[PDB]
Amino acid sequence: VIDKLIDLQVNSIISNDEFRALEQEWLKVQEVCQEDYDNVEVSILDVKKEELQYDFERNLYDISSSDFFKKVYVSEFDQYGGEPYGAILGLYNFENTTNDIIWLTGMGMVAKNSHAPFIASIDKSFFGVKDLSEITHIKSFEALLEHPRYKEWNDFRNLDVAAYIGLTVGDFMLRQPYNPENNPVQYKLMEGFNEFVDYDKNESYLWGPASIHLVKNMMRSYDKTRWFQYIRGVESGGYVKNLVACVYDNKGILETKSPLNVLFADYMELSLANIGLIPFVSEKGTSNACFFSVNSAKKVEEFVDGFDSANSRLIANLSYTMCISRISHYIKCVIRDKIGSIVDVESIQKILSDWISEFVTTVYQPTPLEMARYPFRNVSIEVKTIPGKPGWYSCKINVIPHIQFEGMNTTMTIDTRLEPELFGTNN
Template identity: 30%
Template sequence: MQPDRISDSAASTPVSRVTDAPEPGILDQLLAQAVAVRSTESSQPAHPLDTADLRELFRQILGTVPSSVPELRQARRRITGLIARIDELLSAQVNAILHHPTFQNLESAWRGLHYLWNIKRSFTGRRSGAEKSSDIEIRVLNIRKSELHKDLENAVEFDQSHLFRKVYEEEFGTPGGTPYGILIGNYEFTNHPDDIDLLKRVSGVAAAAFAPFVAAGSPALLGIDDFSVLEQPVELSSIFRNERYTKWRSLRRELDTRFLGLTVPRVLMRAPYADDGRNPFGFRFREEVEGPNRDRFLWGSAAWAFGAIVCRAFAASAWFADIRGVQRGVDSGGLVTGLPSHPFHTDPAGTAERSSVEVQVSEAREAELCEQGFIPLSHCKDTPYSAFYANGSVNEPEKFANDELATANARLSAMLQYVLCCSRIAHYLKVKVRDRIGSQVSARQIEDELVSWIHGYVTPDDRASPDMKARYPLRDARIQIEEIPGRPGQYDMTMFLQPHYQLDQLSSTISFVASRVELGI
């Protein structure tokens, strides 16, 4: 019978038995392939490069075996040429990989994070007291810009998004949580409506968490093809008056954009590899960066540099007022250090260094960029350093025709250095108010307690030393708590803070409002 024949075949033929057995796993398949490869290799002649027989090696490469000194010299020249050709082919392949936009974006992101981490580590242990620089924490959220936009777009309100839950609810809004001081986004934003919408939604999250969000503006946001145009006589104000920037102008009028910063231009993340025998590739390699533009260099977001000076300021004094400008011989303020630079081809080598910033931003151009809502990074001439001389937010300060002081107040409130300072105080106020939830106290009692606390950081002495101003960073401060009509137990808290630093010779004040402060009754 047919079944008997199948049974007999299965008993005598191993292949038939395998068909009835379970399918081998991946490990079994790999082991089987390895055995097959070894058996095949054992039956093939060895590759010439694997043999120790120099005669056979010369015969394979040159076609003959050198038998005299001239022939040996000729053979050496030919072999050297072949090695150089191999290096050339490998160099072309490595250059193609290094300069591919996808790889550049990946390398730039990791090098930017590594730069920020090194800056943070270099300041560890500099400060004594209750708050040490070791308290600086860097947390990474790996999310594409498109995914971030989808998250915020799918939420009915920004406070229902996953980003809000991560940044606000799990830290600032949770007892014992550690509020974020600043959010660095490794993104470039354009004038596309989706990008403008994303900026608006992110600014809402940043404002709620009192954690400014700093990213980068792309050339497209400025209406130019690349940042090199900034070195040409282009009037940016006329570009931003165009109807294509209607949404951008509307965004700048939003109060929450005080917590939003966009840096320009880009910074060098890695110097090009030189053929100096120190490259990690194991062969002669020189990175080709010459071209009609600067795209072959590895550029990155200047937001990393801004994050670095914020870390340095916090490590020095736990305060953020000193994050702009330069003092000669002092590593402080807005001075950016630690970025790579690349020398021009000069004789002797290294006589002149290129800037670590993509383009040279003049003083007039810097003022124009600030006026349009950007944070420009400028190169310090004849030095390997760069600096932030201003740190205005995206917000367009309101101008009052007959009140210069109110105009100055609006400008001050739009500067990230003071937004960071006020955010730091807001984090503490949140904790102190949270401790009172459920207690039988009045709004006036809470107000008196908070005013007493914040006055511990106030000194009216304008001539106080820098160290004294670091300990008492405010010249004046007031806090008001008012009941919300129709909502028993809920209050609005408004704080008025006047830092020691003054703007255009005017004593200015910043005010922030925290709504729905629940004290419980």
């Protein structure tokens, strides 16, 4: 009967707020630093959202004086011996509020300069619904954003800084609740504890933002390959194997519970990519996921001229701005060595090109991984000295990344005109 107490005593503080707030805010921290690669050193910075809300909202029109900006740009990226950051990860959930909109506007103001794509997640309060599962009911989010409720948001999608924000939808289950027959608490070598239950039913037992696995794939897409082509699709990047599902015996026979918050359909995968969101879609029953779309919050536009239309399609694509960013981490990092050496217009075009040259091809290699070694297709690098300043220059590169698959239509038909020898008149 002492078990009856413990099953009440401990279950009183595990269900308690504040206590399970740290759980959420550490389980999803453990999730990131689970892989441990050869050359991918993560790093923490525990800060309340409000302590940054006040920061950017006070220094939106003076970002260089922002305290955070002075702990990522001018601190490690700018300074000599400093080690620059790469792809920040916002563990927060951002709504459609006109306050949280600034939070992104500021963090992106940093990311844009520090060159570090800021990945985050968006709350279910965005689509104006109290249960994220009920987003499936919305037909097309494309027609949704036309609603005047998103006016402030559509303005932000037009900003340049938004080409570095990458917001994710859906939240993966990060902990299985405690049952004796399922996920038993590892008791002690004598203190019988394994017989210990929890208390949940519908949908309210710990979640974590998809942004984790998104970044935790960018890490993967670096130890294996070297660039960030390997974070999309099933066969290529985002697959995310083996997630923490859940099972429960209400009355039937252990009816499984999908690991993901929401079971996105096919046209949901797409109808979100246009809004500038990253859906974390699940394979029904398979207890797995995959990132089909990896788009920034930047507007895609349309345009009449075909070239212009294609430009905006690649810029919105996050996976490229991750790569183009890695060139900035090459320039402002390596060329710093020869800051005093005597060099020319024809010499800087050598050093900068001789490097990137090993990462540009046209031929395709078997398998995705063996080819994702080569992110770019071709590059131009036209540097040129400026008048007045003798020792100063001004470069201007332009990279065309290997355009990813994105979909296709198809019209099948019985022609009966292909082989006229069987249906023709002459016989």
